[PDB]
Amino acid sequence: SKVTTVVATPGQGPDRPQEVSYTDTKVIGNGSFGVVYQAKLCDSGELVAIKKVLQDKRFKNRELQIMRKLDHCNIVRLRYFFYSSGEKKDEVYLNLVLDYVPETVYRVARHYSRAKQTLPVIYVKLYMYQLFRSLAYIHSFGICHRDIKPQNLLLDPDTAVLKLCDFGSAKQLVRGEPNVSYICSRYYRAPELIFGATDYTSSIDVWSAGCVLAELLLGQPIFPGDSGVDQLVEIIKVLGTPTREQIREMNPNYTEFKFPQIKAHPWTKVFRPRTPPEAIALCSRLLEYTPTARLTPLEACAHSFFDELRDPNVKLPNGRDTPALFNFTTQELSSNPPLATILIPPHARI
Numbered sequence: 001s002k003v004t005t006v007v008a009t010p011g012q013g014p015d016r017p018q019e020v021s022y023t024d025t026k027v028i029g030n031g032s033f034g035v036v037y038q039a040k041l042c043d044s045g046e047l048v049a050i051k052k053v054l055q056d057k058r059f060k061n062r063e064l065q066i067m068r069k070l071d072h073c074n075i076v077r078l079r080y081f082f083y084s085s086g087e088k089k090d091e092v093y094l095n096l097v098l099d100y101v102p103e104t105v106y107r108v109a110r111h112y113s114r115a116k117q118t119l120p121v122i123y124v125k126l127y128m129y130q131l132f133r134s135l136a137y138i139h140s141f142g143i144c145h146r147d148i149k150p151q152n153l154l155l156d157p158d159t160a161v162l163k164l165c166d167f168g169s170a171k172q173l174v175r176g177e178p179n180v181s182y183i184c185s186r187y188y189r190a191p192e193l194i195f196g197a198t199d200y201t202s203s204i205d206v207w208s209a210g211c212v213l214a215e216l217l218l219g220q221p222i223f224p225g226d227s228g229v230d231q232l233v234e235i236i237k238v239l240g241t242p243t244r245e246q247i248r249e250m251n252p253n254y255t256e257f258k259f260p261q262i263k264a265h266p267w268t269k270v271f272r273p274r275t276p277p278e279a280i281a282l283c284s285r286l287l288e289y290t291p292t293a294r295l296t297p298l299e300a301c302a303h304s305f306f307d308e309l310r311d312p313n314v315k316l317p318n319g320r321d322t323p324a325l326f327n328f329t330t331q332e333l334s335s336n337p338p339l340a341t342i343l344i345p346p347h348a349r350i
């Protein structure tokens, strides 16, 4: 166990490096983006996750920045950050020291998925509500995850506390500037995004969150497809054919069009015979073609589907009480304060 000692900068305080050392270093994730390690901090003896990434060098790392601003109880925390290396031309490697969380909605989904069962609705609420709330947070700052997917929804089992991770493909959408295109993922990219948009809002994250809720309600991605265009061929078969009235609102210079003129089969039949009325409705007001027609994270939190969480007797399947689900800050209420008369129930404080 080599006690690796480095120079780190508190992603929380100002900018004043102090020696931090760790150990137990063990890889736990490698791929598309990052080489997420796992380690014990020689001091607190705590658990953490080091997210090793290539440091642009000639430019400023966006992930590190967006990460330093944040500080929401439902978004993996940035403890420290330090640099590493390799060789050749000496590409620098940025190290993000973060809060170690175990499972994920992904690993959790792939589990009930091979048990022909499904995530009990009460858990779905706790996970989704907590996700939508984190969204409500970053978005209030104009930041867009642009990659809300089951894989980046970390979740601590014995707490049912979901923290959003991987802010790599996340950028701050500013109005009056076209964003190219490249981003998000396969099963969780939005329609406008497949129609190659460029003036798309944060509403895209709502669409990715929308899917995840649909997937958790079916035990399989709702809009499969490995090919973008082929994917839409599937979205339509579910939601229905997108009118010029819609394709227009989606923004596209698609002055033309020619796709599967299929007549949709109601959300009451897409979801298994048991899906409760509201979890279906919430999904309907989530998965819509018109970007400016979808629920806003804040409103999503206040969808009837999460009432059970606003009930004085919310019994947590684990035993101990449910996560701090109401400490809404003025910032998260930013988009529509009035909804505080719904989000913070009559028995809440702090």
Ligand SMILES: CS(=O)(=O)Nc1ccc(CCNC(=O)c2ccc(O)c3nc(-c4ccc(Cl)cc4Cl)[nH]c23)cc1
Pocket (backbone or CB within 6 Å): 028, 029, 030, 031, 032, 034, 036, 048, 049, 051, 076, 098, 099, 100, 101, 102, 103, 104, 106, 107, 151, 152, 154, 165, 166
């Ligand atoms: C094939 S895939 O699964 O679609 N690819 C893929 C997509 C997204 C991610 C999450 C990004 N990771 C973090 O930032 C990240 C950040 C802070 C953590 O404390 C932490 N703990 C994990 C993790 C836990 C359990 C297991 Cl079994 C595996 C991992 Cl990696 N990831 C993280 C990992 C892999």
